[PDB]
Structures are given as C-alpha cells and as structure tokens.
Design a protein around this ligand. Structure first.
Ligand SMILES: *[C@H](CC(=O)Nc1ccc(C(=O)N2CCC[C@@H](Nc3ncc(Cl)c(-c4c[nH]c5ccccc45)n3)C2)cc1)CN(C)C
Lengths: 325, 248
C-alpha cells in the first residue's frame, strides 16, 4: 500500500493514450487484479538533463499531503521492468497512478451536447469549493484552475486535478511568489497587474470564472494578451481603482496597464439571466480586490451552496464515451 | 498510507552490509564519511541546511535496504544530494555535484564514480526513489531547535550559546544513524539537553514552569530521560576516539 515504486506496470492493461501532459504521455488502463480504471501519467528519465523531472517531484510532494473526495489523489507509483543483473543498462520509466475520470469540464462544454441545470451547477460548485477549502486550509495554492483541470465522472463526482504547478503558502507572514501563473482566461486582476505576494484569492477568482462559464457555456474572459485580458475583466467587473481596491496603486503595472476608460461594474446586468443566489456568489467571487474577494469557506456558507445535500442530488445525463479525438 | 522509517538497536545491527560481513565499526565509518561528503559538497555549492539533511536522510535510509559492498558510499551520497536539491527546491546541475565531488575526494575515492561519473549518479536515482518509496517530504531537528528555543525566556547570551551548541550537535547527529532511531522533534530536544548539561545550564528555569525538572515535556510528549541520555551518548561517542573537539 505504502511501498510505492516497486510494483510493476504489468499489473495494469493499457487501453490507450488519453493525451499529453506536462512530463509525458497519459494512458487509460485497467488493473488486472481489481478490475479498476486508472490514468497513468508516464514519467520518462533516460532522456532529460537533470534526471527525474522536478515538476513531477513537486506533484508527488503535494498529492501525498492532500487526501480529499473532490481532489484527484495519487494511488501509487509503478515502474517498467528492470533486466537480469545490470541496473546501469536498465533505462525504463515510472508511472503515476490516478483514479480514472470520464470527462473534463472543458470537453463537456465544447461539445455542446450537455446542458447543466441549477441543481447540476450547485453540485459541481459545492464539490469544487470543498476540495479547494481543504487545500487552502492545508496552506496550498493550486495556481492553475481552469475547465480542463476539473474532472468529472459519470456518477456525478467532481475532482480538482493537476497540482503540477501548486505551491505552499505562508499565512503567518507574507512572502514573494511566481507572478505568471494560471492560464490567462482564468487569471485574476492582481496577477495581471504584477502582484508577487498573492493569496488563496487567486484560486477563488478562477473558480468564479468557471461559475460564470457554467451558465454561458463559454469562457467569460477570453483574450490572448495580459492587457486585453484586463480590458475584458474591466468591462464586466469595473476598472480597477482605489475606491474599489485601495491597495491597487501599490501594484507594478497599475499605470502601464490601464483600460480604455474607467468602466462601471455591470456583472449583475450582463448576468441577469442567472439565478439571484447564484448571481450573489458570482459577484463576490469576481470582486477585483483580493482582500474583499470571497474565500472558499465563505462560498460554501453562501445561499447558493448552503443547503446543497450532495447525496440527495441525482447524477446528470452525461455523454457515455468519446469517439477518440 | 505512509511508511515507517524507524528501526530498533537490534534491527540496526542486522543491516544489509552487516549481513554481507561488514563489521559495525566499518559501517559506522562509511556512514560518517558519506554524511560528511554530502555535507561538504552541498556547503561548497551553497545549499540550505535542510537540503543537506534531506540528502543525508535519504543516504541513511538507502543503506537499510542495500549493502555498502554493492553500492559505493560517495556515488550514493552524490545521488542523494542531487535528488534532495530538487525536492527542497534548491536544485543543482548533476554536472556541478560531480565537479565539487572531484575537488574534495582523492583519486581512490573518486574511482568509485567510474568512467562516466554523471551517468553513475543518474542511473542510481531510479533505485534511490524506489528505495525511499517516493516518500520525499522529510522534516529535520533544526526547525524544532528554533521553535522550542524561541519559547525560552532568560539570559539571551546563554540561550544563544545553547542554540549554537545544539545546532552543532544536530550536524554531528547526521553522521550517525540517529535519524533512523528517533523523530526530529526528539533529537532537537536531545541536543538542547546535551548543550545545557555541557554548559551547566538549568533549562527548566527558562520555561513557563520554572520549578519542574522535565522542561522538555512542554515540547515533546512522553519521552523518558534515558532516551535523551542515549542520544547524547551516541553524539558524544563521535568525539571519543575520533579525535574531534566539541564547541566553545
Ligand atoms: C478512445 C480511447 C480513449 O480512452 N480515449 C480517450 C477517452 C477520454 C478522454 C478524455 O477526454 N478524458 C477527459 C479528460 C479526463 C480524462 N481522464 C483522466 N483521468 C484521470 C487523470 Cl489523472 C487525467 C488526467 C490528468 N491530467 C491529465 C493530463 C492529460 C490527460 C489526462 C489527464 N485524466 C479522460 C480522452 C481520450 C476509444 N477507443 C475505441 C479505444
């Protein structure tokens, strides 16, 4: 169980390639013994300059510390096969074993064959913010939340995935972190303006973009460059200014990066069609000032997610299988 | 979930090297030499004390599953440091570890690395990871030495002397198998105990309960005095016929 690394990949049957990841191919597979489905992140190491990827080391470090329902967990690590009597000739590879998940959220929306109801969105966000609360409580930032990293199986279970670019957070005192994190569409305004000493608020912003995306069926802030991305946020959320966000003047790029004009916030107008309680949550989550922004705990305490009983909720009619593409 | 990394005195006498006929005094020396190698190489590359300590823990653990007669000390030391840099976010190029290893080691010692030193280290990493069961996260005594010392209240020069002595004894402990015997919290408390005794300091007078002789019970739970005495004796054994001299 705990004796990782020494069990063999022979123990699984490779069904096929799922896709490419950060440090190798990813494979769907079935365990020969338990008959259970998994994903196998292959980690090559004959190639590569500094041996076993440090990015994989980070993901291993964090996932062994995170144990939660709605967080993708690493079951074990598994190896190729190592010949008769010369480990120096042996130049195989390792495989990180994860519970298999049927869909990612980007795939489901991009098809246009699925429609999420209020009850379906309630269930997804409840689960997402529970796993995110857990991670933040254990001083971890995800730093890469987006639709492609939110996995979903056919029995309604949501899992936050891909802690490759995750990081420890110091709450008792502030410290400097890497600025360029999160894919641009889900990146918060503080990072755009150049904040290095950032908080768990960055992850809540990304989850806010997703809440909106679940109603619009399309990313709400969709642009190619930092400047354009801030322009689009400002149009909907209002231009960043001291009246709303006092400490914004302290940020490196507040004067370099500026919107066309001082836009008014009109989120409640543009998302009038969304339910009222859902709109209250979205507003709090896409608040520009990170110190005023909703925490993951607070989202669970909101009206929209307060009384969502997950065992009582029925699973959504999802597509069975993809046609491999 | 997570594996057990602690062995008895009996289990530490039956290591893979002992089973292959290596006497305990020689294994002790190989462990001393290999730890200091990791320590000296990483210090020349300007690495954090936790990096060095993580390297040394991997090294001590490695040789509970493998024999020194099959895996040369210094290659493993180099491999353990290389992985530790990556785990502790202070990475170095393997190239540079070999370079620094060459400057410190003589020609017979460096012979262990063979024709292609880098390749010998890179190859071994696969086995290192398997051996440590991908349990990369390790805590050391230093952080606990600091945490417990910040909570003491008294003469700042004497307390500083305690912490400085204690710090040296943590470094010394990493030469031994103490990290395989006791948790880092306990070893932290033990080095404070050791320094206090040598300095003729009564540490209880710096605590929240000045009267009570077992000052350590507010930091570490359920640890008898005999355990701390045994840790001290193992650390002091390093100065006995080793011809080292202890601080201040
Ligand atoms: C086709 C062969 C086949 O199985 N093809 C296939 C099926 C499903 C997908 C696919 O789109 N998804 C959605 C994304 C999630 C993925 N499952 C999954 N489970 C666990 C983990 Cl840990 C991951 C994962 C995490 N990080 C990743 C990076 C890259 C890829 C996956 C991944 N993903 C399933 C794609 C292809 C039928 N033929 C007839 C045999």
């Amino acid at each position: 169980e705990s004796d990782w690394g020494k069990r063999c990949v022979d123990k699984f049957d490779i069904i096929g390639i799922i896709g490419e990841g950060t440090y190798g191919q990813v494979y769907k597979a079935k365990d020969k013994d338990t008959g259970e489905l998994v994903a196998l992140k292959k980690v090559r190491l004959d190639n590569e300059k500094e041996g076993f990827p440090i990015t994989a080391i980070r993901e291993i470090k964090i996932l062994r510390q995170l144990i939660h329902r709605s967080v993708v967990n690493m079951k074990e690590i598994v190896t190729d096969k190592q010949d008769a009597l010369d480990f120096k000739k042996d130049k195989g590879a390792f495989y990180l074993v994860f519970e298999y998940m049927d869909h990612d959220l980007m795939g489901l929306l991009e098809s246009g064959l699925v429609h999420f109801s209020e009850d379906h969105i309630k269930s997804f966000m409840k689960q997402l913010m529970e796993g995110l609360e857990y991670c933040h409580k254990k001083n971890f930032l995800h730093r890469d939340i987006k639709c492609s990293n939110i996995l979903l199986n056919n029995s309604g279970q949501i899992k936050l995935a891909d802690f490759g670019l995750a990081r420890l957070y110091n709450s008792e005192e502030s410290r400097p972190y890497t600025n360029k994190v999160i894919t641009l569409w889900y990146r918060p305004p503080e990072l755009l303006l150049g904040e290095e000493r950032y908080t768990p608020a960055i992850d809540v912003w990304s989850c806010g973009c997703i809440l909106g995306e679940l109603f619009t069926k399309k990313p709400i802030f969709q642009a190619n460059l930092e400047l354009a991305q801030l322009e689009l946020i400002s149009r909907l959320c209002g231009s960043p200014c001291p009246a709303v966000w006092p400490d914004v003047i302290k940020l490196p790029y507040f004067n370099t990066m500026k919107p066309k004009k001082q836009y008014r916030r009109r989120l409640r107008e543009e998302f009038s069609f969304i339910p009222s309680a859902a709109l209250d949550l979205l507003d709090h989550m896409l608040t520009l000032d990170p110190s005023k922004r909703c925490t993951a705990e607070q989202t669970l305490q909101s009206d929209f997610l307060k009384d969502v009983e997950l065992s009582k909720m029925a699973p959504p009619d999802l597509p069975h299988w993809q046609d491999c593409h | 979930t997570k594996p057990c990394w602690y062995w008895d005195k009996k289990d530490l006498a039956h290591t893979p090297s002992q089973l292959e006929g290596l006497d305990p005094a020689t294994e002790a020396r190989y462990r001393r030499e290999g730890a200091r190698f990791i320590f000296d190489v990483g210090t020349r590359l300007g690495l954090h004390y936790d990096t060095l300590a993580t390297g040394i823990i991997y090294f001590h653990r490695f040789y509970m599953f493998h024999s020194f007669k099959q895996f040369p000390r210094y290659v493993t030391g180099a491999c353990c440091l290389f992985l530790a840099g990556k785990v502790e976010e202070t990475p170095k190029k393997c190239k540079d570890i070999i370079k620094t290893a060459r400057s410190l080691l003589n020609d017979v010692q460096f012979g262990q690395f063979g024709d292609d030193p880098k390749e010998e280290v890179m190859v071994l990493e696969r086995i290192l990871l398997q051996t440590i069961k991908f349990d990369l996260q390790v805590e050391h005594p230093y952080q606990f030495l600091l945490k417990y010392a910040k909570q003491l209240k008294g003469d700042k020069n004497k307390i500083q002397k305690l912490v400085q002595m204690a710090w040296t004894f943590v470094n010394d402990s990493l030469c031994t198998t103490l990290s395989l015997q006791w948790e880092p919290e306990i070893i932290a408390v033990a080095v404070m105990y050791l320094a206090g005794r040598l300095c003729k300091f009564e540490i209880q007078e710096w605590t929240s309960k000045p009267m009570y002789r077992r000052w350590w019970e507010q930091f570490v739970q359920d640890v008898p005095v005999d355990v701390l005495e045994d840790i001290c004796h193992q650390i002091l054994d390093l100065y006995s016929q080793g011809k080292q001299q202890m601080p201040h």
